[PDB]
Write a structure and sequence with these properties.
zymogen; Thrombin, subunit H; disulfide bond; mainly beta; 6-stranded antiparallel β-barrel; 35% strand; binds L-alanyl-N-[(1S,2R)-1-benzyl-2-hydroxypropyl]-L-alaninamide; 224 residues; Peptidase_S1_PA_chymotrypsin; 8% helix
């Protein structure tokens, strides 16, 4: 996260982290006891999921491994459209005060709506610096008509944009799969932007979740 700050402890009980052994790879959210949602470009042969703590390595966090993952069939390794993926935990996550399910959308929020995105991604760029505590930052959703003026062809109806004018507030390396929540429900998952990160007027592109809740619901059942 760039130009943000440490999130208030315990405010993101549905936020998780995908690790390769002990090194941060991406982020994600907990759908339910045995399902994690995240980015499709964060695919791995095996994951070590971190849950129940804003501090990586916390002795009180839950560490669960996952071997199976399901990508949206329409995803593209070239354009990154439909960039979402479901991860199945080898064992059920124990829900507690620090571990809860995210509130999926039932409607799409319009432009202007303020949101918040979090992650353990690098807080600098091009230079690298990975924090141990979860970072937060506020951004506003941008209209498809405005975002196109910036990315043009690089945008499909399933992509959502957010950010603040002339501001570096944004996501970066290691934040993919992280949640963008607005008005209570998950509105998106970090996907892509420009590099170096935090370039002024270069919006962050997310996976608009208000259009994949049916796919998320059917997929879980299918492999339940
Ligand atoms: C996979 C995830 O970590 C990452 C998120 C991110 C990285 C850099 C800038 C903004 C967000 N997504 C990607 O690696 C994505 C394909 N990267 C892009 O921004 C490309 C290189 N333009």
């Amino acid at each position: 996260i760039i130009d943000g700050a440490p999130c208030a402890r315990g405010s993101h009980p549905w936020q998780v982290a995908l690790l390769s052994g002990n090194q941060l790879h991406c982020g994600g959210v907990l759908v339910n006891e045995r399902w994690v949602l995240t980015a499709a470009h964060c695919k791995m042969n095996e994951y070590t999921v971190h849950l129940g703590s804003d501090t990586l390595g916390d002795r009180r966090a839950q560490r669960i491994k996952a071997s199976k993952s399901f990508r949206h069939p329409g995803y593209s390794t070239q354009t990154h459209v439909n960039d979402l993926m479901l991860v199945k935990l080898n064992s059920q996550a124990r829900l507690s005060s620090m571990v809860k399910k995210v509130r999926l959308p039932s409607r799409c929020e319009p432009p202007g709506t303020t949101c918040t995105v979090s992650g353990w991604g690098t807080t600098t760029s091009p230079d690298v610096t990975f924090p141990s505590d979860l970072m937060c930052v506020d951004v506003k959703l941008i209209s498809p008509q405005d975002c196109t003026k910036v990315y043009k062809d690089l945008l499909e109806n399933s992509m959502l944009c957010a950010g603040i004018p002339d501001s570096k507030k944004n996501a970066c390396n290691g934040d993919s799969g992280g949640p963008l929540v607005c008005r209570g429900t998950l509105q998106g998952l970090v996907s892509w932007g420009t590099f170096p990160c935090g370039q002024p007027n270069d919006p962050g592109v997310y996976t608009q979740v208000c259009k994949f809740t049916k796919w998320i619901n059917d997929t879980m059942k299918k492999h339940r």
